[PDB]
Design a protein around this ligand. Structure first.
Ligand SMILES: CO[C@H]1O[C@H](CO)[C@@H](S[C@H]2O[C@H](CO)[C@@H](SC)[C@H](O)[C@H]2O)[C@H](O)[C@H]1O
Ligand SMILES: OC[C@H]1O[C@H](S[C@H]2[C@H](O)[C@@H](O)[C@@H](S)O[C@@H]2CO)[C@H](O)[C@@H](O)[C@@H]1O
Ligand SMILES: OC[C@H]1O[C@H](S[C@H]2[C@H](O)[C@@H](O)[C@@H](S)O[C@@H]2CO)[C@H](O)[C@@H](O)[C@@H]1O
Ligand SMILES: [Ca+2]
Ligand SMILES: [Cl-]
Ligand SMILES: [Hg+2]
Length: 496
């Protein structure tokens, strides 16, 4: 459950948020495969309710009505084709499994669903599954409202309705089996693992029961006896009754402290400095490295949802975002997930975006295709952070230094730091309001390396900055605080 099952040498997964199956299949072949990306986390592939007020929000996909593979991203046919095509080029697929609940209890009854299935929230009727009134936790919840009123009581967090969503009775074998059969269909198609949505709102034991029913991965792409990769979404910043450690037995867990603290450090808030990152990882109170799935931002907190947080860095703060993502990709802690989003019109009232509901680019409800420009960026308001040179090259950097020890740390006692990974990679950051000029020991063999942040190695030359490492391992670095990207990264494969 802890092994990502990526093709050997690939160390990151990318969340292609709200992307259509056909677009992801193409992306795997023309980009993700050749550029060394390990996998793709897809939006929920199961049928959801249609929300017209507001107009098709991204969150309607977190209100399941059935387990039919029929959404705005595509149908079963297109989903199977995407999985097959991506697996054939060495890119895995990870499914966002929404299994804690169904649709909103106060939703209207009818066929206003992405595939035409009927449902009646009031009577707890889901014919397409099928689920009935006794497949839910209505009588199990003890709050006056029926919803989660306090996060200091583990019972109501797991047995009550999360934002009015009908809570499934996961202790029942009927429910456990229905969910397992849905997940097994996905595994048989070729999916490598799952992101278990709202794991915090389910009992660790119930999740384990579902996981014990899962088949081994498809032998057409995976070795015999391969178990699906599992990463549970558990928001734990401390101070609450539920802890991330309660879920360690099922598989990996999302470490939300990672992005919250990294963001604070890079923004230089609350007296934090980059020099403090020397003991980054478990030294900062994070879960064990082999149990964590790390990321700077996710689909929720980049727009104030989930636990939110003001320190969270997103594409909106591009310069700092690249620094944070670059640090994450270079550091050995955890398994890394890169975010890929779409842009929406923000409207801040009282320091909060009220347009955080806006769904993916669309033409009257139909999600727009991902167009690729001449400079390799995306059109139609798809941000495609995974295509930014600075990010794609750091994804490659992580592959090159996989398994290498954290080494040769240096800092100026403020916000200028540098470190290497064995004798295969080195990175230097300048997050101070003044210039950086030092001769650092890189731990790398002598020669001329291409900086992969400002450019690329093309043939026997570099398109960006060139760094010369003398015979003893030292190299002079000069980074201005006004530089577009205030950090340099060189590795064994960028050497001329
Ligand atoms: C899981 O959280 C994300 O999805 C939910 C569900 O779509 C929304 S809440 C959303 O739906 C509920 C239930 O119908 C109503 S009533 C409380 C609410 O007004 C809607 O916003 C959540 O915002 C997402 O983060
Ligand atoms: O609103 C949808 C989300 O609701 C909560 S996020 C929740 C967090 O878990 C708590 O630790 C504190 S920060 O309050 C937060 C806001 O209610 C669920 O955990 C999410 O999974 C869900 O998506
Ligand atoms: O590899 C494609 C391009 O990637 C980025 S452009 C990127 C920029 O770095 C970010 O700060 C904001 S402005 O988004 C931009 C994409 O719209 C490189 O800087 C480019 O040189 C490169 O062409
Ligand atoms: Ca629950
Ligand atoms: Cl997540
Ligand atoms: Hg419904």
């Amino acid at each position: 459950q802890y092994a990502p099952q990526t093709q050997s040498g690939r160390t990151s997964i990318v969340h292609l948020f709200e992307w259509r199956w056909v677009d992801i299949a193409l992306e795997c072949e023309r980009y993700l495969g050749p550029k060394g990306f390990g996998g793709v986390q897809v939006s929920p592939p199961n049928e959801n309710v249609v929300v017209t007020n507001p107009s098709r929000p991204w969150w309607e996909r977190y209100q399941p009505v059935s387990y039919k593979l029929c959404t705005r991203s595509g149908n079963e046919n297109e989903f199977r084709d995407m999985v097959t095509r991506c697996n054939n080029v060495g890119v895995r697929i990870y499914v966002d499994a929404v299994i804690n609940h169904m649709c909103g209890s106060g939703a209207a009854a009818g066929t206003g669903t992405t595939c035409g299935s009927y449902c009646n929230p009031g009577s707890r009727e889901f014919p397409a599954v099928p689920y009935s009134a006794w497949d839910f936790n209505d009588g199990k919840c003890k709050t006056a409202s029926g919803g989660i009123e306090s996060y200091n009581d583990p019972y109501q967090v797991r047995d009550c309705q999360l934002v009015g969503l009908l809570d499934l009775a996961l202790e029942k074998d009927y429910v456990r089996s229905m969910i397992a059969d849905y997940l097994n269909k996905l595994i048989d198609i070729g999916v490598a693992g799952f992101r278990i949505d709202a794991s915090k709102h389910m009992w660790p034991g119930d999740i384990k029961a579902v996981l014990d029913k899962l088949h081994n991965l498809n032998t057409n792409w995976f070795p015999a006896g391969s178990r699906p990769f599992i990463f549970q979404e558990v928001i734990d910043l401390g101070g609450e009754a539920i802890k991330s450690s309660e879920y360690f037995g099922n598989g990996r867990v999302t470490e939300f402290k990672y992005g919250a603290k990294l963001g604070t450090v890079v923004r230089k808030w609350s007296g934090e400095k980059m020099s403090y990152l020397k003991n980054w990882g478990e030294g900062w109170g994070f879960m064990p490295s082999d149990r964590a799935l790390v990321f700077v931002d996710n689909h929720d907190n980049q727009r104030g949802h989930g636990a939110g947080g003001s320190s969270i860095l997103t594409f909106w703060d591009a310069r700092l975002y690249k620094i944070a993502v670059g640090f994450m990709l270079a550091h050995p802690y955890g398994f890394t997930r890169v975010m890929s989003s779409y842009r929406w019109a923000r409207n801040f009232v009282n320091g909060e975006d009220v347009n955080d509901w806006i769904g993916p680019p669309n033409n009257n409800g139909v999600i727009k295709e991902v167009t690729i420009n001449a400079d390799t960026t995306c059109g139609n308001d798809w941000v495609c952070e995974h295509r930014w040179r600075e990010i794609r090259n750091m994804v490659w950097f992580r592959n090159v230094v996989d398994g290498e020890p954290f080494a040769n740390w240096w800092d100026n006692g403020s916000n200028q730091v540098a470190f290497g990974r064995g004798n295969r990679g080195f990175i230097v950051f300048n997050n101070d309001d003044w210039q950086l000029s030092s001769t650092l020991q890189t731990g790398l063999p002598g020669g001329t390396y291409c900086d992969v942040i400002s450019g690329d190695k093309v043939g026997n030359s570099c398109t960006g900055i060139k760094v010369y490492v003398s015979s003893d391992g030292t190299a002079q670095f000069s980074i201005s605080n006004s530089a577009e990207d205030p950090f340099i990264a060189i590795h064994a494969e960028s050497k001329l």
